[PDB]
Design a protein around this ligand. Structure first.
Ligand code: SAH
Length: 255
């Protein structure tokens, strides 16, 4: 099976195991991507990826639909703000994970939302992705207005400089609370004791079996009463089996 042989090679080069991704769907996206570059097989595509780092980094950067924006599904962030933050705040700083942060819109949202919380003891956000080019971009912190349409104007004025007409940059007072790190949700060790884990619009790529395994690792990585925030098409069935209780739509609390 040519995709089988290719999956083996990709795992060896990047540690990413495509057997843990929906097959028909990823197989089609990657066929499309090698064909656009005029490869004629996975075999030939694999050979180039081993010899061209840029092609490899480009391919990781193209294995999902990764366009993002601040406050993606804006009303869910008000839920987080009003309904969820009271459940998780304690006397200690909040420890947050933005798991699959892409170009950084999400973790920056989290930081700007949390900074507005007067008297919150502190906040710490780990922001991870497998895509190093997206992490590079997130670190730089420069966004075009298209990524900021849901940022309320006072928040945009407070936490970014506007450097040109539709070009803004996140201030250091926000960046300093975020650590951008290369990390594979499917393979790498998870830190522990998070108050909040935000993992949105990534599980959609994984097989049912792979994401079920990741819900249990996440439930484990939460402090008791901590919360998991998922994407607006995602759902965990029988959350009680993971020791999670649904808090509002798309939020799960560790009991
Ligand atoms: N195994 C894996 N571990 C970590 N990140 C992964 C991954 N597989 C894919 N990704 C990343 O998942 C991202 C999905 S885009 C979603 C970004 C953001 N959470 C939002 O909601 O808009 C991409 O940046 C892709 O690089």
């Amino acid at each position: 099976d040519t995709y089988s042989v290719f999956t083996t090679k990709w795992k060896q080069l990047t540690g990413v195991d495509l057997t843990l991704y929906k097959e028909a769907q990823m197989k089609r996206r990657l066929t499309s991507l090698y064909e656009k570059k005029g490869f004629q097989s996975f075999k030939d595509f694999a050979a180039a990826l081993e010899k061209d780092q840029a092609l490899l980094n480009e391919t990781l950067d193209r294995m999902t639909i990764n366009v993002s924006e601040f406050y993606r599904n804006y009303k869910r962030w008000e839920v987080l703000e009003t309904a969820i933050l009271p459940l998780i705040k304690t006397s200690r700083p909040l420890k947050i994970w933005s798991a699959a942060c892409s170009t950084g819109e999400e973790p920056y949202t989290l930081a700007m939302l949390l900074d507005q919380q007067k008297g919150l003891p502190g906040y710490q956000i780990l922001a991870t992705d497998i895509d190093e080019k997206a992490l590079e971009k997130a670190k730089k912190g420069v966004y075009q207005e298209r990524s900021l349409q849901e940022v309320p104007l006072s928040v945009k004025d407070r936490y970014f400089t506007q450097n040109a007409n539709r070009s803004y940059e996140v201030k250091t007072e926000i960046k300093k609370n975020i650590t951008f790190k290369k990390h594979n949700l499917l393979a790498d060790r998870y830190e522990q004791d998070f108050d909040l884990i935000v993992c949105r619009n990534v599980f959609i790529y994984f097989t049912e079996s792979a994401k079920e395994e990741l819900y249990l690792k996440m439930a484990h990585s939460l402090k008791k009463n901590g919360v998991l925030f998922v994407g607006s098409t995602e759902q965990i069935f029988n959350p009680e089996k993971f020791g999670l209780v649904p808090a509002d739509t798309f939020f799960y609390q560790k009991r």
